[PDB]
Each structure stands twice: as structure tokens, then as C-alpha cells.
Amino acid sequence: GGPSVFLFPPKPKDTLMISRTPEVTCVVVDVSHEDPEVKFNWYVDGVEVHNAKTKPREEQYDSTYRVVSVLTVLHQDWLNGKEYKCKVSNKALPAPIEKTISKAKGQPREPQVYTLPPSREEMTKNQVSLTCLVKGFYPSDIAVEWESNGQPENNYKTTPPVLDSDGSFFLYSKLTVDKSRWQQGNVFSCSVMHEALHNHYTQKSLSLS
Amino acid sequence: GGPSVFLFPPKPKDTLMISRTPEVTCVVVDVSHEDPEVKFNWYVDGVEVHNAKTKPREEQYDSTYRVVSVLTVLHQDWLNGKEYKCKVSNKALPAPIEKTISKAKGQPREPQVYTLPPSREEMTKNQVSLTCLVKGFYPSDIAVEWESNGQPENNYKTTPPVLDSDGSFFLYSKLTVDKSRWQQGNVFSCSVMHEALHNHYTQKSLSLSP
């Protein structure tokens, strides 16, 4: 019946592209209305840093408080495997709560990416499903997307990562499209982002090949 | 730190094929070495059953002992959505713990099964990947298996079910075979089992074209 801490890692795409801003997020929920102050302490690989920011309190419609501190991290810092220790302390907790996080420990492995067109059998339907297999990559932090003529493809679900026989991972990403398009000749591309790829980005094509 | 329960549901294959026996299982972990006394009360839709059965606990190697009681349920009683309630009770525990499982509710839906050959760009490897798309099914309970002429293929992995946009589930299974076996012909079949499938079973072949 006190505060609980949650520490989330940066978004897969955020660490892979310098363009992006990789952030680490520490959340503090159930902060006694009585004593609503939270003190965050950030340690990068043991060393305490300070450039963290804390987004304003938010009355947890049950009068408790929700407090969040966001720490910007350097890409090559997270990819190089440093640990992020977020120490949260509050006037109502004996000792502070600590939660550390980091990139999965393991030798990175490049993801082969193959595109597979819809089954003839599936053509009886009006909607068709395009398949993008992405096997043999480590760690599992990866981003898979679809686009057609530049513009991104909306309708698509990706199966979570699955641990393959050889310590590696893999998954599929199913982009659904009006058969109409698939038959016309439109071209769709599956793009994959992961640190073990050249430029952290490969892109494979798929159409009425 | 005390006794808790983990009520598990039957394996998807067991509820579909009569030949086998589907069973609901009730685990009880953290049974204080002090008091290992555990009673098991099973009730199927209110009614209580006595055909239950408790598995001889084993020392979990850290004071605590875990106790499991398996109850064999009838295929249709589960497929028809009957609830199964497990009532664990121990001297060193406030009130009796309770857990109840039951098949997901909703109109079952027949899974669409497609087999997709390995990619050409993938033919530059020692081994290739055979894909089996199983989409549009509900409830997510399902079993997917591979095989080739009698002997079942035992080097495949299947992603877990994924909630599709239309409220139904879909998965992809991946069978890895030595590129050789693939070109030399040899057909492979992806067998899918679900309550919505006629006879609870279907299977698509898949082999090299010319």
C-alpha cells in the first residue's frame, strides 16, 4: 500500500536512428496524497547523471499521485549496453526504490529478411495478406514497418518475437491489402530496423513479382 | 510469501480429439514446509466433482512445496463453456483460495490455412524456411504441427496467436528443413487443429513446383 516504481527502456527505433531521441522512463505510481513529493536519482552505469526531467504530477483519480522522470540517453550508450539505475525515494518509504534496465546481454545478430506473397488459396478473398519474415536476429528489440510508394501502410499486425532454435529470434509481419491493389501491380515494401543491420535499416520489396 | 494458486486450462489438442484426455489443472505453490496440508475441492458449474485427483507433491528444494491436482474434464463440457472452479485450502492460509477457468466466450471461427514457400532471396542458405499462415480463427485456442510423409517434422517453431484487426487471431508457423530435402521435391504438410475446423482438423501440403 505505498509507491510502486516502473522503469521502461527506449523505443526500438529511437536508439537506432540518431535522428530520433532515445529516452528512458521511470514511473512512480500511488504517491500518498499526504506526502506528494518524489525525488529521482539517475545513475548511468554507476555514475549519477542529472539531465533528467520530471513531467508534472497527475492526480490519480483516487487522490494518489503519478510521477514520471524522463532521461535522455545517447544511442551508442544504450547500444553499448550501459545500465540505467533510477532510484526513487519518497518521504513515506524506508529506503528508496531502485529499478535498473538495459539492452539485452548478447552478441548482436543480423536479421535476414524475406518477403513472401499471398497464397493462391487466399485469392478467393477480397482482402489479401502480404508476409514479411524476419528471422535470426538478436537482441529482440526491433522495428518492422510497411510502406507503399513512400507513404506508410496502415493495416498491419506483427507477431511478437519468437526465440528460434539457435538462440536467435524471428517474427512475421502481415500487411493486409485490397486484393485490388495486389493484382493491379502496386508495390509494397517491408522495412526493418535493428542495430545489427547496415545503417540500422534494410528494406525489402514485394509485389506481383 | 504464502500459498497461492495457478489454475491452468487443458491443452488445445486434448479438447479437440476424443481419443485423448483433456484435463484442467490446479497448482498450489509456496506451501510452507510447516503446513503442507492441502485440500482440493473441485466444482464444475456450481456442482462439485469427486473424480478429481491430487498429484504427490515434491520438495521444490527451498522449504516450499508445490501441490497439483489434475481433474479430467469431458470434451464437450469444456468446448461448451462450462466453468471449472478449484478450491484450494490450507491451514496456514487466511481463507480458501479460489480460481475459475472456462473457454473464451464468443462464436468460434474457422481458421484460414495457407502455406507459403521459402523466399528466393532465402535460397542462398544451407537451410530454408517453410511458412504456414493460420488467420481468422477464434477462440485463440489452437494447435499447429508439421510433418512429411508419416514422420512428423520436429524442427519448427510457432509464434503465439496475435489479435488481428477484426477481433480474430492469426499465427505463422515456421518449419526449417535442409534446402536439399526441399528441392528434391518432398511434400510437407502443416496440420492445424481447432474447434471451428470441420473434424477439428485440416492440413495443407506444400512442396517445390517444377
Give the SS3 label for residue B183.
helix
Asked if B174 lies within 8 A of A170 by C-beta distance, the reply is yes
End position of a domain, from candidates B46, B73, B102: B102
The string of DSSP letters for B32-43 reads -SS---EEEEEE
What count of CB pairs under 8 Å joins A to B?
Answer: 75
**Which of A150, A200, A153, A146 shows the shortest CA–CA distance to A172?**
A146
Bridging pattern class, strands B47-49 and A23-31: unpaired
Number of Cα atoms under 13 Å in the Cβ half of residue B71: 28
| A26 and A92 in a common domain | yes
Q: Based on C-alpha coordinates, what's the Rg of chain B?
A: 22
Looking at the partner chain, which of B119, B170, B176 has a beta carbon nearest the beta carbon of A174? B170
The distance of A88 to chain B (nearest Cα, Å) reads 24
**CA distance readout (Å), B43 to B51, B73, B140:** 10, 11, 25
Spatial contact of B22 and B73, defined as CB atoms under 8 Å apart = yes
Helix (H) or strand (E) holding A143: strand A143-148
Beta strands in B32-161 (DSSP E): 38-44, 47-49, 54-62, 64-72, 84-90, 97-101, 112-116, 127-137, 143-147, 156-158
Q: Do A157 and B135 touch (CB under 8 A)?
A: no
Q: Are B114 and B192 found together in one domain?
A: yes
Q: Which of B38, B16, B21, B20 is nearest to B29 (CA)?
A: B38
Name which of A110, A120, A122 to mutate to probe chain B: the one with the most chain B Cβ atoms within 10 A of its Cβ. A122
- Judge if B67 and B117 occupy the same domain: no
| Alpha-carbon distances, residue B96 vs B12, B49, B58, B99 (angstroms) | 29, 17, 22, 10
**Residue of A110, A113, A114, A175 to mutate, interface with B, max B Cβ within 10 Å:** A114
In the DSSP assignment, the letter for residue B153 is P
- Rounded to whole angstroms, the Cα distance separating B55 from B68 reads 5
Identify the residue among A154, A169, A171, A172 best suited for mutation to test binding to B, counting B beta carbons within 10 A and taking the highest. A172
3-class DSSP state of A78:
helix
Can you tell me the distance from the alpha carbon of B189 to that of A6, in angstroms, rounded to the nearest whole number? 45
Task: Characterise A179 by phi-psi region: left (phi > 0), alpha (psi -120 to 50), beta (else).
Answer: alpha
Measure in Å the smallest separation between the Cα of A17 and chain B Cα atoms.
Answer: 27
Beta-sheet pairing, B38-44 with B84-90: antiparallel
User: Do both A118 and A203 map to the same domain?
Assistant: yes
Domain's final residue, options B102, B126, B150:
B102
One domain, residues B107 and B90? no
- Set of chain B residues whose Cβ sits within 8 Å of the Cβ of A175: none
- Contact state of A122 with B129 under an 8 Å Cβ cutoff: no
Cite the beta strand spans of A9-107 per DSSP E.
23-31, 39-44, 47-49, 53-55, 65-72, 84-89, 97-101
Put simply, the chain A residues between 120 and 159 with a CB less than 8 A from any chain B CB are: 121-122, 125, 129, 131, 133, 135, 155, 157-159
Burial A21-45 (b: 16+ CB within 10 A, else e): ebbbbbbbeebbeeebebebbbbbe
Q: Are residues B133 and A171, on separate chains, in Cβ contact within 8 Å?
A: no
Residues A63 and A142 in one domain: no
Is B122 found in the same domain as B84?
Answer: no
- Same domain for A91 and A29? yes
Residue B40 sits in a domain whose CATH number is: 2.60.40.10
Burial class (CB in 10 A: 0-12, 13-18, 19+), A52: middle
Alpha helices in chain B (DSSP H): 12-16, 75-79, 179-183
State the virtual CA torsion across B75, B76, B79, B82 in degrees, nearest 10. -110
Identify the bridge partners of residue A6 per DSSP, sorted by sequence position.
A27
In angstroms, the CA B2 to CA B93 distance is 7
Q: B66 forms bridges with which residues in the sheet?
A: B58
Q: Tell me if A146 sits within 8 A of A188, measured CB to CB.
A: yes
Q: Measuring CA to CA, which residue among A70, A77, A71 is closest to residue A18?
A: A77
Q: How far apart are CA A37 and CA B48, in angstroms?
A: 52
Q: DSSP class of residue A122?
A: G
Alpha-carbon torsion angle A88, A91, A95, A97, nearest 10: -20
Let me know: does B26 contact B90? Beta carbons within 8 Å. no
**Which of A102, A133, A156 is where one domain is finished?**
A102
Query: Do B116 and A112 make contact, defined as CB atoms within 8 angstroms?
Result: no
**Which structural domain, as residue segments, surrounds residue A57?**
3-102
Q: Which of A159, A169, A189, A206 to mutate to test the interface with B (most CBs of B within 10 A)?
A: A159
* Nearest Cα to Cα of residue A190 among A138, A136, A148, A154: A148
Q: What gap in Å lies between CA B189 and CA A47, rounded to an integer?
A: 56
* CA dist., res. A153 & res. A158, Å (int): 13
B52-to-A160, B69, B75 alpha-carbon distances in Å = 37, 7, 16
Q: Is A176 on the interface with B (CB under 8 A)?
A: yes
**Buried/exposed A121-146: b ≥16 CB within 10 Å, e otherwise:** ebeeeeebbbbbbbbbbbbbbbbbbb
Domain identity same for B79 and B137: no
Q: Does B107 share its domain with B89?
A: no
Answer whether B205's CB lies under 8 Å from B132's CB: no
Closest CA to A71 of A47, A91, A93: A47
B148, B111: one domain = yes
Question: How many domains are contained in chain B?
Answer: 2
Grid cell digits, residue A177: 491489402
Deposited experimental method: X-ray
On whether the CB atoms of residues A93 and A2 are closer than 8 A, the answer is yes
Could you count the other beta carbons within 10 Å of the beta carbon of residue A63? 11
Nearest to residue B29, comparing CAs of B48, B8, B50, B51? B8
- Please check whether residue B207 touches A, CB under 8 A: no
Burial B42-52 (b: 16+ CB within 10 A, else e): bbbeeeeeeeb
3-class secondary-structure state, position A126:
coil
Letter string b/e over residues A80-110, b meaning 16 or more CB atoms within 10 A of that residue's CB = eebebbbbbbbeeeeebbebebebeeeeebe
Partners of B155 on chain A (C-beta within 8 Å) are 165
Query: Do B90 and B124 belong together in one domain?
Result: no
**Structure resolution, Å:** 2.8
- Burial class from Cβ neighbours inside 10 Å (0-12, 13-18, 19+) for residue A54 reads middle
Tell me the C-alpha distance between B150 and B4, whole Å.
44
- A89 interface with B at CB cutoff 8 Å: no
